[PDB]
Nucleic acid binder design. Structure first.
Lengths: 567, 53, 61, 453, 149
RNA sequence: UGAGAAAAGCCUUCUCUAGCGAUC
C-alpha cells in the first residue's frame, strides 16, 4: 500500500512548496493539486493495472506543465526552472518507462512517448527511446523511416541518418518504400551541400552518391512501376538534370514489352490557335502508341490507348472522336478488345448525343460475346434512344441467344417496352412467361412490377385478380403487401376487414423479423376512421412474442417514440 | 555477473540481458523462486532484442 | 487471531486469549457445568469449597 | 537578481514539535572523537524534523469551531439549534436511546471510534456499531453490572459483574470468568501494555495481562474502599483517589505508590488527565474543581467553586474538559496551546433526563457520550475531536484484513509490565549508580623527653 | 452563529473498486504515537531473538579427496570453480553450484605444498615435495586422454 | 457417547490454493 505512494508525494512536495514561494499558486490550489495527485497515484500502484490509469497520470502532468508555463509568462518569473519543470519531466519519464515496459506490443504508446520526448525532453533521451523502439520493433520499416527522418530534419546529421537507412535495408531487403526514401534522402543531402558552397567534393554535388542507389535498387527490384517511381522523386529535384535524363533513358532500353513504360512516354509528349497547338501534340502521342503496337502486340497495351482516346473525348470534340472510331475498328478486327471496354466507349457515346457510332459498338459486341446479357441490355438502351423500330426483333434474338433461363433485367425491360407500344394482352403474356422462367429469389422484383402494372393497365378489380393468383407463390417481399394495402386506401370503399386480411398475411410471412410492419399495423387501427383502437392492446401483446432478438428491442423503442409526439 | 543470453525459439531469435543473480545457491529451495516466480524473474532479466521469423 | 507464521509463533508462543488454564481453570470447570446442568457458576463453587472442607477433616483425623 | 534566493523555509515552531533533543544542557566536550559523533547526532535529528515540517501540508482536515455573534453566549445555545445548522452527516450522530426499565448505564467507546458498548445496572449488556445503527450483540447477564470496557479491538469486552470479572466476545458468547478479581468497581485498560487494571471494593488493585492470560501484580492500596480511578495515556501510571483527599500514583512493579498528591480538603470523587499527560482534573466534596500541573510541579493551576458537585470528568483529544453534575453537563474550553482549560465560563451546556453516571469522548469525532438513568445520549461538541488520524494506528474505516494484521504488530511489540515509570523516556537515561559501582571494580583491578614517651 | 464539524468525504477515505487497495492517511504527530523509546526497544530485542532463531551457517560439504587437504585456490573469473590439493598429491577441481568434482589429477608424488592460478584463468601452478614446479591447463582434457602438464 | 439425537434457514471467526504485483 501507500508506502510507495507516500514516498512519491513527499518527493513531489518540494516543487509545490517552491511554487507557493513564487506566488504563482495559492495555498488552496496546492491542496487541490496534492489531493488529485494522491488520487491518481493510488490508481497506478494497485496490484491490478490498466493502461488508462497511466495515460490519465501523464495527461494530468502535461496539463499542469502547460498551466505553469502560461502563468509564468504573465507573472514574468523565469527563475528556478530546474526545481519544478525538470522534476516533473523526470517523473513523467519514469511513468512512461514503466508503462512501455509493461506493454511492449503497443506502438501507439511508443509514439506518444516519442512525441513527449520531442516536446519536453533532452535529445539524448529521445535517442535512447528510438533505440529501445528499434530493438524490439525492427520488423516495421515505417519506424526506421521516422527514426532516420528525425536525424535529418531535426538533428541535421546526414551521416547518422545514412547508417540508420543502410541497416534498415539489411533487415528488409525487398521493401520498395525503404529504397525510395533512401534515394530521396541522398538527394536532400546534395541540396544541403550546394547551398553550403554558395554561402562560402564535386562528385557528390553532382548527385553521384544517389545514383549508386538507383542501379542497385533496380537490380534487386525488377519492376516497371518501381523504376518509374524513382524517376518521380528525381524530377522533383531541380539540380542534376542529367540524373533525371540518365534514368529516363534507361526506362525505354531496360524496361520494354511492358505497357506502363510505353504509356509514360506518351503522356510526357502530351505535356483557338492554342486549341490547334493542343491538336498536334495529341497526334504525336498517338503515333508513339502504334510504334508500341508493332513492337508489343499484347492486349494490355491496347486499352491504355483506347482509354487515352476516351479521356480526350470527354475533356474540338469532333477531331477527338474521329480518332476514337479508327482505333476502335482496328482493335475490333484483331478482336483483342475485351468486353468491359466495349461498354465504356458505348456509354460515353450515348451521353454526347451520338447515336450512330453507339449502334456500331453494340452490334460489334454481340457477335463477339453472344452469351453476355449485360451488353445485350446495352444494345437495347441504344435502340430506345435511337427510336428505331427494331425493338421487337431485339428481344426475340436475345432470348434465343440466351440459353440460360435467368435474364432478369431483360425480362423487366421487355415489360417496360411492351407497356409503351404494345397491347395490354401481350404485356400480360410477357409477365406470365417471366414468372415461369424465374423461380427463385429473383422472382421477388418480378411479382412487384406485375401488381403495379395491373393497377395502371386495369383498375382495382384487375389488381385483385392478380393478387389472388400470386398470394400463394411463397417467395415474397413486404413491398408486395404494402402495395396492395395502398391500393385499398385509395379506393373510396376502404373495407376495413380487407385491410386486416392483408396485414395478417404479411405478418404471417415477415412477422418474426420486421418491426416496422408491426408498427404500421398498430397505427392503422388508430388513425383510420373505421379502425378499432381497442385492438391495440392485443397487437402489442402479439408483437412481443413473434419478434426475435434485436428486432424485439427496436419495436419497443419505436412505440415509446410513438407515444411521444416525435413519431 | 552481467552477461547476455541468446535464446532460440520457433517464432524467432531473442536476446536477453542478465543484471544480477545469486549464483552459488541457485539450485536451492529458497533461491529457486528467483527464476520460477514471474515478478522476480522480471527484476533480474530484460529483453533487449527480438528478431522474429 | 490469524494463524501465526513460523517466525511469529516463536516470539508469540504461549499467547492464547481463549484458553487460560492457570488463572481461572475454565476448561476443566466447563465439563462439570455441562455434564450436570448447573444454572449458576456459584452453585459449583459452593460444592467445591465444601468438598475441600470434608477432605481437610479426613486428613486431620 | 532573482528576488528570493534561498530554498523554501519551514516554520520553526512545527520543527520544534518534531524534536527530541535537550538543547538546554551545556555539556562540555574537549575531544574531537566525541565532537564528530555529537555533530552527526544533531545532523540526523535536524534532517528528520525538517521532512515532517514539510509534511504538514499533507494534512487535509480542519478542526471544528463554534462562535456566537453580536455578544451571544455559547452556554445557552442548545443542541436543537446546532443540528439544524450542521450537515445531514453529523446530524445523524445525535440520538437519545431511552431505556429506563434497566438501571443507570456505563458506556465505553472503543479505541477506534467506530464502536460503542454499554452495560446496565440491572444487567443489560450490549455492544453496537454506532455510526451505522447496527446491533452487534445484546445479552442480559443475570447479575448486576458495575462497569464495562473494551479490550484492544472490538472483539473482546470485559464486564465487571457483581461477584467476579467476566470476559465476553463481541457476539455475546462468554469466554472467561476470573474469580481472583472479585467485587471490582472500576475497570480500565492499558492499550500498549495489554494490561487491564482493576480496582476492587476490598481495597486491592489488580493487573492482568490479557495477551498471555496471567496476573502480573495484585497490590493492596491500603486505603479502604476504592472507587476513583483513571490512567495517564502518556505516562501509563494509574491514579487512585481516596476519601482522605489524596491521589496515589501506582505502577505494577512497585509495592508502594509512586507518589501521593493531596488535592482536596475532603474526599475526592473524580480524576481525569489529558492525553498529552500534562494536566490532571480532580473534583471533591468541597465543591472545588482543580487543574494540576503534572510536569514536575504539582501545583493547582486553576480553581473554581461550584454550586453542585462534579461527579465525573473527561478530556477530549483537543483538550476540552466536561464535568457531569447531577443531570447537567458543562464543557470548559480553552485555546489549549500550552495552557490549561479556562474555567471562567463554560463552552456548552445540556440538561439530561436523569443523573449522569458516565462520560467519555469519542476518539476521532465531535460527539460526547453521556450515560444516565434515563438512557444513553449523544451530544454534538464542535471542536473536541482530533481531525486527522493515523492509518496504521487507528482507522475507523478499516477492513478485516487491515485489523487482523494490525493486532499481530501490536502483539509482537508488547511492553513488559516493569518498565512503567513516571518518565516514559526513563529507558534512555544511563543508570548512574551502576556506573559508580562499575568504576569501583575498575579502580580495584588497577621536648627532648617527648620521644621517650 | 458560525458552525462547522469535521465531515470526512467517504469517497476520499474508502476505495472505489474491489480491484483497488485501501487508502491509508498517515499522521506523524508525536501525541498520536507515544512510548517511542519503550516501543522501539522491544522491536530491537525481538530482532536479536529472530537472528538467533535463523542462524544456520552450514551449507554443504564436498568429499572425494583421500588425504588431508592442504591447499586451496579460487578461480579469478568464475565464482563456482575452486581447486584443492591433498597430501597424497592429487589436485581436484570442484563445482560449487553442483557440489561435485569435475576433474581429478595426480599432480605430484608426496605432498602438494602450494597452488596458484594465473590471473587470466586458463592455467594454474602447483608445487610438491618432488622438487618440481608444474604448470597445467585449466580446460579439461578432451575425450578420455590422460592429462599432461 | 452423554452442552441427548436428527434436520433446515441467518450472522461471526478463520483456513487453503490459483492468477495478479514488484521491469522506474
Amino acid at each position: 500500500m501507500a508506502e510507495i505512494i507516500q514516498e512519491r508525494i513527499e518527493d513531489r512536495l518540494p516543487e509545490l512548496e517552491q511554487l507557493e514561494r513564487i506566488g504563482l499558486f495559492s495555498h488552496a490550489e496546492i491542496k487541490a493539486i496534492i489531493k488529485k495527485a494522491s488520487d491518481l497515484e493510488y490508481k497506478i500502484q494497485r496490484r491490478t493495472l490498466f493502461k488508462e490509469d497511466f495515460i490519465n497520470y501523464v495527461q494530468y502532468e502535461i496539463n499542469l506543465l502547460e498551466l505553469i508555463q502560461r502563468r509564468r509568462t504573465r507573472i514574468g518569473y523565469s527563475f528556478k526552472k530546474d526545481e519544478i519543470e525538470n522534476s516533473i519531466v523526470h517523473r513523467v519519464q519514469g511513468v512512461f518507462q514503466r508503462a512501455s515496459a509493461k506493454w511492449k506490443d503497443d506502438v501507439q504508446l511508443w509514439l506518444s512517448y516519442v512525441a513527449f520526448c520531442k516536446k519536453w525532453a533532452t535529445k539524448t533521451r529521445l535517442s535512447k527511446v528510438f533505440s529501445a523502439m528499434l530493438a524490439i520493433h525492427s520488423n516495421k520499416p515505417a519506424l526506421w523511416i521516422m527514426a532516420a527522418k528525425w536525424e535529418m530534419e531535426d538533428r541535421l546529421s546526414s551521416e547518422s541518418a545514412r547508417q540508420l537507412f543502410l541497416r534498415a535495408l539489411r533487415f528488409h531487403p525487398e521493401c520498395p518504400k525503404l529504397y525510395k526514401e533512401y534515394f530521396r534522402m541522398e538527394l536532400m543531402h546534395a541540396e544541403k551541400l550546394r547551398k553550403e558552397k554558395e554561402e562560402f567534393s564535386e562528385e557528390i554535388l553532382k548527385g553521384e552518391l544517389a545514383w549508386i542507389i538507383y542501379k542497385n535498387s533496380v537490380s534487386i527490384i525488377k519492376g516497371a512501376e518501381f523504376h518509374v517511381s524513382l524517376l518521380s522523386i528525381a524530377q522533383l529535384f531541380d539540380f542534376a538534370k542529367d540524373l533525371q535524363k540518365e534514368i529516363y533513358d534507361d526506362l525505354q532500353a531496360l524496361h520494354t514489352d511492358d505497357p506502363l513504360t510505353w504509356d509514360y512516354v506518351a503522356r510526357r509528349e502530351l505535356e483557338q490557335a492554342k486549341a490547334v497547338e493542343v491538336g498536334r501534340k495529341e497526334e504525336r502521342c498517338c503515333a508513339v502508341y502504334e510504334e508500341a503496337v508493332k513492337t508489343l502486340p499484347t492486349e494490355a497495351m491496347w486499352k491504355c490507348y483506347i482509354t487515352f482516346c476516351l479521356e480526350r473525348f470527354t475533356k474540338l470534340r469532333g477531331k477527338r472522336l474521329e480518332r476514337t472510331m479508327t482505333v476502335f475498328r482496328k482493335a475490333h478486327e484483331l478482336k483483342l478488345l475485351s468486353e468491359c471496354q466495349y461498354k465504356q466507349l458505348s456509354v460515353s457515346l450515348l451521353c454526347y448525343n451520338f447515336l450512330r457510332e453507339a449502334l456500331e459498338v453494340a452490334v460489334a459486341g454481340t457477335e463477339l460475346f453472344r452469351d453476355s446479357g449485360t451488353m445485350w441490355q446495352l444494345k437495347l438502351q441504344v435502340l430506345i434512344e435511337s427510336k428505331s423500330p427494331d425493338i421487337a426483333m431485339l428481344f426475340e434474338e436475345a432470348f434465343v441467344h440466351l440459353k440460360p433461363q435467368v435474364c432478369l433485367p431483360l425480362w423487366i425491360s421487355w415489360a417496360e417496352w411492351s407497356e409503351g407500344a404494345k397491347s395490354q394482352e401481350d404485356t400480360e403474356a410477357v409477365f406470365k412467361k417471366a414468372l415461369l422462367a424465374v423461380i427463385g429469389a429473383d422472382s421477388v422484383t418480378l411479382k412487384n412490377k406485375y401488381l403495379d402494372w395491373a393497377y395502371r393497365s386495369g383498375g382495382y378489380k384487375k389488381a385483385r385478380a392478380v393478387f389472388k393468383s400470386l398470394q400463394e407463390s411463397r417467395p415474397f417481399s413486404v413491398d408486395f403487401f404494402r402495395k396492395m394495402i395502398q391500393f385499398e386506401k385509395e379506393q373510396e370503399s376502404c373495407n376495413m376487414a380487407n385491410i386486416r386480411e392483408y396485414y395478417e398475411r404479411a405478418l404471417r410471412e415477415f412477422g418474426s423479423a420486421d418491426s416496422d410492419l408491426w408498427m404500421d399495423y398498430m397505427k392503422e387501427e388508430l388513425n383510420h376512421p373505421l379502425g378499432r383502437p381497442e385492438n391495440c392492446g392485443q397487437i402489442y401483446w402479439r408483437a412481443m412474442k413473434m419478434l426475435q432478438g434485436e428486432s424485439a428491442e427496436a419495436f419497443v423503442a419505436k412505440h415509446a417514440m410513438h407515444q411521444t409526439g416525435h413519431l | 555477473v552481467l552477461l547476455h543470453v541468446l535464446f532460440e525459439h520457433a517464432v524467432g531469435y531473442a536476446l536477453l540481458a542478465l543484471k544480477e543473480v545469486e549464483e552459488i545457491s541457485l539450485l536451492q529451495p529458497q533461491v529457486e523462486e528467483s527464476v520460477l516466480n514471474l515478478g522476480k524473474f522480471h527484476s533480474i532479466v530484460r529483453l533487449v532484442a527480438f528478431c522474429p521469423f | 487471531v490469524r494463524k501465526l507464521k513460523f517466525h511469529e509463533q516463536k516470539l508469540l508462543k504461549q499467547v492464547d486469549f481463549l484458553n487460560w488454564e492457570v488463572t481461572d481453570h475454565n476448561l476443566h470447570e466447563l465439563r462439570v457445568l455441562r455434564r450436570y446442568r448447573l444454572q449458576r457458576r456459584e452453585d459449583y463453587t459452593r460444592y467445591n469449597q465444601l468438598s475441600r472442607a470434608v477432605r481437610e477433616l479426613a486428613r486431620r483425623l | 537578481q532573482d528576488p528570493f534566493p534561498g530554498p523554501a523555509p519551514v516554520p520553526v515552531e512545527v520543527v520544534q514539535k518534531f524534536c527530541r533533543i535537550d538543547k538546554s544542557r551545556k555539556l562540555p566536550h574537549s575531544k574531537a572523537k566525541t565532537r564528530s559523533r555529537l555533530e552527526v547526532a544533531e545532523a540526523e535529528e535536524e534532517e528528520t524534523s525538517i521532512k515532517a515540517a514539510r509534511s504538514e501540508l499533507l494534512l487535509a482536515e480542519e478542526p471544528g469551531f463554534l462562535e456566537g455573534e453580536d455578544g451571544e453566549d455559547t452556554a445557552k445555545i442548545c443542541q436543537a439549534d446546532i443540528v439544524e445548522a450542521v450537515d445531514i452527516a453529523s446530524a445523524a450522530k445525535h440520538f437519545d436511546l431511552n431505556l429506563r426499565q434497566f438501571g443507570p448505564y456505563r458506556l465505553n467507546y472503543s479505541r477506534t471510534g467506530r464502536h460503542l458498548a454499554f452495560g446496565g445496572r440491572r444487567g443489560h449488556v450490549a455492544a453496537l456499531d454506532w455510526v451505522t445503527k447496527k446491533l452487534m450483540c445484546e445479552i442480559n447477564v443475570m447479575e448486576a453490572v458495575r462497569d464495562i470496557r473494551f479490550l484492544h479491538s472490538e472483539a473482546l469486552l470485559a464486564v465487571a459483574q457483581n461477584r467476579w470479572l467476566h470476559i465476553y466476545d463481541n457476539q455475546g458468547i462468554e469466554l472467561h470468568c476470573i474469580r481472583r478479581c472479585d467485587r471490582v468497581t472500576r475497570l480500565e485498560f492499558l492499550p500498549f501494555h495489554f494490561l487491564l487494571a482493576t480496582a476492587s471494593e476490598t481495597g486491592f488493585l489488580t493487573y492482568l495481562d490479557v495477551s498471555v492470560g496471567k496476573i502480573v501484580a495484585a497490590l493492596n492500596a491500603r486505603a479502604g474502599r476504592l472507587d476513583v480511578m483513571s490512567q495517564n495515556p502518556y505516562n501509563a501510571v494509574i491514579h487512585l483517589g481516596h476519601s482522605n483527599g489524596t491521589v496515589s500514583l501506582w505502577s505494577p512493579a512497585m509495592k508502594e505508590p509512586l507518589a501521593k498528591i493531596l488535592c482536596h480538603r475532603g474526599g475526592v470523587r473524580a480524576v481525569a488527565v489529558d492525553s498529552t499527560g500534562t494536566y490532571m482534573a480532580t473534583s471533591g466534596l468541597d465543591h472545588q474543581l482543580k487543574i494540576f500541573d503534572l510536569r514536575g510541579t504539582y501545583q493547582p493551576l486553576s480553581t473554581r467553586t461550584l454550586p453542585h458537585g462534579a461527579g465525573h470528568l473527561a478530556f477530549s483529544q483537543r483538550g476540552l474538559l466536561v464535568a457531569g453534575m447531577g443531570d447537567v453537563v458543562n464543557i470548559w474550553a480553552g485555546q489549549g496551546k500550552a495552557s490549561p482549560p479556562s474555567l471562567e465560563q463554560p463552552y456548552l451546556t445540556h440538561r439530561l433526563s436523569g443523573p449522569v453516571h458516565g462520560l467519555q469522548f469519542c476518539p476521532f469525532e465531535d460527539v460526547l457520550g453521556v450515560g444516565h438513568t434515563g438512557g444513553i445520549t449523544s451530544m454534538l461538541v464542535p471542536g473536541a475531536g482530533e481531525p486527522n488520524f493515523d492509518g496504521l494506528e487507528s482507522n475507523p474505516y478499516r477492513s478485516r484484513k487491515q485489523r487482523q494484521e494490525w493486532e499481530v504488530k501490536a502483539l509482537l511489540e508488547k511492553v513488559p509490565a516493569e518498565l512503567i515509570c513516571l518518565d516514559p523516556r526513563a529507558l534512555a537515561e544511563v543508570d548512574v549508580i551502576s556506573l559508580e559501582q562499575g568504576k569501583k571494580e575498575q579502580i580495584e583491578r588497577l621536648s627532648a623527653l617527648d620521644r621517650f614517651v | 452563529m458560525k458552525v462547522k464539524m469535521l465531515s470526512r468525504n467517504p469517497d476520499n477515505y474508502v476505495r472505489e473498486t474491489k480491484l483497488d487497495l485501501q487508502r491509508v492517511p498517515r499522521n506523524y504527530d508525536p501525541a498520536l504515537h507515544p512510548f517511542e523509546v519503550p516501543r522501539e526497544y522491544i522491536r530491537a530485542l525481538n530482532a536479536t531473538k529472530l537472528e538467533r532463531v535463523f542462524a544456520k551457517p552450514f551449507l554443504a560439504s564436498l568429499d572425494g579427496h583421500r588425504d588431508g587437504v592442504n591447499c586451496l585456490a579460487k578461480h579469478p573469473e568464475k565464482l563456482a570453480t575452486v581447486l584443492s590439493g591433498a597430501c597424497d598429491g592429487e589436485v581436484r577441481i570442484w563445482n560449487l553450484t553442483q557440489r561435485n568434482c569435475i576433474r581429478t589429477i595426480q599432480a605430484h608424488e608426496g605432498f602438494v605444498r602450494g597452488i596458484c592460478t594465473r590471473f587470466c584463468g586458463t592455467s594454474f601452478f602447483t608445487v610438491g615435495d618432488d622438487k618440481t614446479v608444474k604448470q597445467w591447463k585449466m580446460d579439461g582434457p578432451g575425450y578420455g586422454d590422460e592429462e599432461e602438464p
